[PDB]
Amino acid sequence: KLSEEQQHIIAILLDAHHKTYDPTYADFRDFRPPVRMSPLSMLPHLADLVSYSIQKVIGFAKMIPGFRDLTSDDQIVLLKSSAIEVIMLRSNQSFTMDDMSWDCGSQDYKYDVTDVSKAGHTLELIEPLIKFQVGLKKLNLHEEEHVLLMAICIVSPDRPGVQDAKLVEAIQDRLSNTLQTYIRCRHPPPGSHQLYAKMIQKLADLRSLNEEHSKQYRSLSFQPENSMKLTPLVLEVFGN
């Protein structure tokens, strides 16, 4: 199939991704220097990376056909709830199964399980986080499916606080059918076996990851000393 409108949706999302994801990770030099030596030594660096990533995820969302039609408040509710999920999702691009780490160019910007723990997280989040990256990496998604999955994650109707739930659903459904159809026409077997159902399952895994993220964030921000080390956007998006 792949109608005219669907080839457009994919072309748009591919470009929107391209305009918001620099595979050379050159801006990482603006972030506060990472410290891998009191723990939480990676909090300043990773706080900045995440802050940066939230900005890029937002720019991506604004290019999702249909997203601009949502109200101001619904756009806000969808971004606040999916931000950490799309960052985990989009980070799969730099993640490598070679050594289970996110490799962004240089040693300075190569993150692993210990850096994550030096940001305030335990295996509570890390174990399933790496499990997530591994299952996602194995699916060997086409970049088309990758951007479609991120957009579907952002435009989810069940996010609490949503108002125009039916409008959100209409936008997401349009994206799902574009993805379901792209897989059937563009993704060849075996890689396409259960591919869609596996992709949706990843969205559920992310709901679990978000949940853990939220609980530990409550404990971290529990002490202004650490909360003071974040950025203004991170505080606003995850909670102030």
Binding site: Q55, I58, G59, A61, K62, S72, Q75, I76, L79, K80, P232, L233, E236, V237, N240
Partner: peptide, 11 residues
């Protein structure tokens, strides 16, 4: 909760 920054980035 009014999100000034998220608001401006979406605008």
């Amino acid at each position: 909760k009014n999100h000034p920054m998220l608001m401006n980035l979406l605008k």
